[PDB]
Amino acid sequence: TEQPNWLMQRAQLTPERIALIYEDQTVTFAELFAASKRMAEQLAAHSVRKGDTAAILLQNRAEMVYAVHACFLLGVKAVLLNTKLSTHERLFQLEDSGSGFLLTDSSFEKKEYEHIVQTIDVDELMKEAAEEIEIEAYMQMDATATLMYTSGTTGKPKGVQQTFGNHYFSAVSSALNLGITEQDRWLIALPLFHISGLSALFKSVIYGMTVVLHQRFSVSDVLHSINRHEVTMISAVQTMLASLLEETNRCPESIRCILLGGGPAPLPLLEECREKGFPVFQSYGMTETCSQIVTLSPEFSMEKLGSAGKPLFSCEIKIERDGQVCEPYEHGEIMVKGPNVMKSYFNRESANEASFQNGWLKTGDLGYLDNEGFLYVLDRRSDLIISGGENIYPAEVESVLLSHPAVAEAGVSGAEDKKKVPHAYLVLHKPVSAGELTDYCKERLAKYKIPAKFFVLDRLPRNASNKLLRNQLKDARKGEL
Amino acid sequence: TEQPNWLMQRAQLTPERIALIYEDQTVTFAELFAASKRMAEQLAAHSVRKGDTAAILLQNRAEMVYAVHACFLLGVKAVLLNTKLSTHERLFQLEDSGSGFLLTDSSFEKKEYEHIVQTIDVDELMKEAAEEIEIEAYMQMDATATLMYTSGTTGKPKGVQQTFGNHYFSAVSSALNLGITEQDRWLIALPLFHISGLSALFKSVIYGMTVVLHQRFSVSDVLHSINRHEVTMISAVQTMLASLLEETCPESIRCILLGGGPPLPLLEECREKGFPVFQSYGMTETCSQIVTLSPEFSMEKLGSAGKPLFSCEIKIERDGQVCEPYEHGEIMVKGPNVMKSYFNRESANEASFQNGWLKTGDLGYLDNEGFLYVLDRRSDL
Ligand SMILES: Nc1ncnc2c1ncn2[C@@H]1O[C@H](COP(=O)(O)O)[C@@H](O)[C@H]1O
Ligand SMILES: Nc1ncnc2c1ncn2[C@@H]1O[C@H](COP(=O)(O)O)[C@@H](O)[C@H]1O
Ligand SMILES: [Cl-]
Ligand SMILES: [Cl-]
Ligand SMILES: [Cl-]
Ligand SMILES: [Cl-]
Known part of the structure; x- marks a missing residue:
């Protein structure tokens, strides 16, 4: 039902491993726990109480990392806001989530939301002083850690409630798929308010693994960074990958894993990836599943063109049509199950009752399995x-x-x-x-x-x-x- | 609350990775699942039903591994009996555990147990036809997978109820500790009925890692296996570590997991000759190690068990309050790999559990940097 706070424990175990490399700075796990602990103390000063909901509106910065962990240490549900939402779209999610706070910075128009939540500036906040506090030393595995909104093109977005257990199992199940070394370092150049980026922060403290963090994707900054810091793992969408290929002859030798999310890769693109030595893991997963739940290893890239692969360990998929499981190649709705699958949509009785069935989540995705159990995703x-x-x-x-x-x-x-x-x-x-x-x-x-x-x-x-x-x-x- | 059966899913995912290297043969996960499903169908023919308790009395053989998995596949608690005990120590545990069955072979005298349990000969059992069954595709995390008795110098042995959950979290915590690799292969020349050998079987199927199995320990046979099969991980007691170092450390080996007591002479020869030895602290109650000390620290954290595995916890108590470093007290462990409760020991269960923590019955201290030093019971x- 509970584990020690991953960050506290990671700090206790390996205090001087690098947690975060961000631009110039490096931050150790001890430092990160220190940063996050004091930020939690500052938020504590502004009336943020255990059991509250704070929303985060930030670009990828070290401070955003601290804010996520600080919320954990105060026992505050963190809402991660897409920074490209319109003012109206942000307001809806602020209201729907029941946030009492918005942690943002001067780069956004704070005062636009002051009428509904207590706005707070990450940098103005950090300067302050406050009574030190006794942090939540334990994570409750079934508690909602973060709330993340879906961005389907149909309907009003739903808040996915992701537990500490979800995130832990995501991290663990992924490590059994990919292996983990002490030499492993993970580059994140996607937003931390999407689950591909956020889940890396949890992989980090749990594995004791360095995350190299980029505010945006720029192919040359990344390639340099990859070499400057000996990056072994990177997360990408198809366009970031296309760009890496045109800017290189062979793949940077540090890289052992390229986790491709978002959609399939066209046959020529993978074929070059194989030619140039790009180790591409295709994947399927969603906000609802706390990052990937199905993956395809490089050695199956060409052989299983168009497949997202097979489920991670501890996880399951199936295909259903009107309550009945489908034969191989028969199109139906993809359903997923496993300890990484979300609690439930927040405050969405109808979607919950419709999307769940005996511990399985209906994804809203159409697909099929071939005879060997590889998954092919059709679309919505x-x-x-x-x-x-x-x-x-x-x-x-x-x-x-x-x-x-x-x-x-x-x-x-x-x-x-x-x-x-x-x-x-x-x-x-x-x-x-x-x-x-x-x-x-x-x-x-x-x-x-x-x-x-x-x-x-x-x-x-x-x-x-x-x-x-x-x-x-x-x-x-x-x-x- | 549930995971698909580790063996079933592992066979689904990577069917042709090597599960098991035993003597001549190798067994793929597909094969391991086929063999364990067959044996489970044959046990069912002999009226072994879901919810029963079966004891297992065997040396390290491929057939023992199948038996473990066959129980899981049937929904049958497995009791692993130490083969070096006296017959009566064994009979006590058969009665205590409520076993209705003993799976053993010609190596043991069945007639010595059949006045209490039905006995089944693994090798005869295999030779028989059996109708197909619908296996148990899910492991419930909170159900007992295996019952394993305490080697009590402190009186009447207790059955440690080890859940599927405990085994999984034990295997996951250890991976976070040591890292895992596709090329990784683990050698076991220790008994499978001790948790140190049993737990590799679960590591194997959860990681999809080969286990190199060995009926007993003989330095020559082990080093030949190490090299022919490029072992990277090995589990060893103090004795075996002296024996291997006396005969020279293979590049192939990456981790040597040491179990039992803490020897200033011993460790440096390891460092010198190039042995990556991980000292550790575990008990049957913690379904393997719960604390480990990396080679980077052998000198000088001398006499230390190391630090808690991720997810796991260590404190040290005297009277009813927390001790300070380095003040001595009773070691208390906590974590998802830690046993829920002893089988049918109401008194010892309340005696041993104060609020989610297990009183370990060992004494020790923590240093300024929070490492564990274990003294004596x-x-x-
Ligand atoms: N490998 C993939 N192939 C096809 N569609 C995908 C894949 N990965 C993700 N998606 C789509 O992206 C959705 C997840 O969106 P999000 O929650 O924004 O990450 C899934 O429901 C799919 O519809
Ligand atoms: N490194 C160690 N130092 C001291 N005692 C140990 C060590 N490893 C194991 N033990 C003892 O072995 C007991 C469990 O042994 P077993 O239940 O046979 O695995 C523990 O309670 C410890 O008291
Ligand atoms: Cl590691
Ligand atoms: Cl539900
Ligand atoms: Cl025999
Ligand atoms: Cl081999």
């Missing part, structure tokens, strides 16, 4: 297009459209015909003929899947997580033929 |  249930009687998965068409030389971004929505039909929306680099494109699709897609008409834009309607909002491409800009 | 003084 909600974006399904039944054109004929048959199903159309937008991610499939977008993929074929995107692989074209002249296509920059592709989006597929289901319009109407006296028979729903598929429409494409292409951002372009070069110009491209609708005949030149229809025949690219002809070669690569069943006829009924191919986009009826084509539209063109300069940008496609994305939410604050860069996710394509399909319901809304009707419309923005002008499309020809 | 409080009993004799």
Whole structure:
């Protein structure tokens, strides 16, 4: 039911291992526990009470790391806010979460939220003095540690309640998938308010592993940093990976693991990764699962094109259609289970009752398993297009459209015909003929899947997580033929 | 509260990794799961049902490993009997544990136990046909997996109830401690009925790590195995460590896990000849080690057990209050790898547990830097 605070214990065990390398600075676990302890004392001074909820609105900085751990030490549910949310979107999550506080800095417009929560400035806060406190030495495994909002393109975002046990099991289960050395160091250049970034902070204290932290992704800063600090592990999305490949001949020899999240990698991209010696682990997972729950090892990259792999140890997946488990290759909804799967959505009775079934979580993702149990992810249930009687998965068409030389971004929505039909929306680099494109699709897609008409834009309607909002491409800009 | 069966999931994930190296043979996890499922189907034919208690009396053999897993797959508590005990020490434990079965072989006299339990001969048992069964695909974390008796110099042995949870957390904590590698291989030449040998079996299937198994310890056979199979981890008692060092330390070996008492002569020859020896403190109650001392500290934290594994806790108490460094007191352990309760010992359970902590019955102190020094059991003084 409880473990010692990971940071306190990590500090007690290996006080002088590096916890955080951030720009110039290095921070030891002892230092990090010290920083975090005093920040907790300062928050304690501003009336932040055990059992409260503080929201965090910060770019990737050492202070954000301290704030997360400080909340832990005070016993305060931490809400991680996407910094690219609109003012309105932030306000909703502040209200919905029941935050009493917003810990932000001068880089945001604090006063915009003062009317609903007690705003606090990470840097103005740190200067202060306060009565020292006796910290929570124990984490309760079933307590909500962090709340994180989903960013699906359907509906109002849901707060995922992630327990200390969730995070612990995520970290452990991942180490059994990837192994762990004392020489391991992990580069995080993704936001810490997304679970790919946040979970690394917990991997760190639990493994006693250094996290090298970048505020943003810039390929040269990362490559330098990789070499300056002997980085063995990096987390990436497809675009960060594409950039690493074009900026290198071979893969930096320090790197032993590239954890690719977000979506599949197109066949040419992986094939070069194998050629240039890039050890790419593809993965599937979500906010609901506290980072990855399924992974594919490099040695299966080409052999299992399009697969997210197999579940981590202690975890399970299955595929279901109307209450019944699906045969191999039969499309259905992906369901997940394991000690890393979230408690429940916060304050969402309807979604909870609908998304759970006997300890399994319904992910909202469509997919299937092949005979060996590898998982293939189709994309969201909600974006399904039944054109004929048959199903159309937008991610499939977008993929074929995107692989074209002249296509920059592709989006597929289901319009109407006296028979729903598929429409494409292409951002372009070069110009491209609708005949030149229809025949690219002809070669690569069943006829009924191919986009009826084509539209063109300069940008496609994305939410604050860069996710394509399909319901809304009707419309923005002008499309020809 | 539940995990899929470690062996089943491990066989699903990496079917052809080597589970077991024993003598000639090697057994893949797919094979280990097939063998353990078969044996479990054969036990079921002999009326061994879910919720029963089976004792196991065997030397280190591949067949013992199957038996352990067959119990898990059946939902059957496994009692591991020390083969070097007297028959009556064994009969006491069979009665105490409520075993309905004893799995053993020709090496032992079955007729010596059958007036109390049904006896089953592992090798005859295997030769038999059996209908297929629906195995137990989940381990409940809070259920007893194995019952293992205390080697009590302090009176009547107690059955340590070791949960699936305890074993898992023990294996996970140790990994956080030592690190784990695909290339890692662990040699066991110690008895499987002691927790030090048993726990490798669980490490094996949770990590997906090969265990190199050895019926007994003979320096020549062990060093030949170490090299032929590139062992990286090995579990050893004080005696075995003297014997191996006297015959020279293989580059292949990365960790030597030492168990039992704390010898200033001994350790430096290890450092010199190049032995990465990890000193440790554990008990049956903690389902393996709960404290370890890295080689980086042998000199000079002399006489120290080391520091608690992650998730695990160590304090030192006298009267009913916390001692200070370095003031002596009774060592008390705590953590998810620590046994819940002794089997059918109401008095000893309240005696031994003060608020989530286990009174260890050993005395010791912590230094300024919080390392553990273990002195002697409080009993004799
Ligand atoms: N490997 C993958 N392949 C396809 N879709 C993915 C993959 N990983 C994540 N996703 C999508 O991203 C969602 C998780 O979103 P988030 O909570 O924002 O990380 C999942 O439900 C999937 O729909
Ligand atoms: N390094 C050590 N120093 C002192 N006593 C030990 C050490 N290792 C094990 N023991 C004793 O062995 C007991 C458990 O032995 P066993 O239950 O047979 O594993 C512990 O309670 C300790 O008292
Ligand atoms: Cl380590
Ligand atoms: Cl639930
Ligand atoms: Cl025999
Ligand atoms: Cl071999």
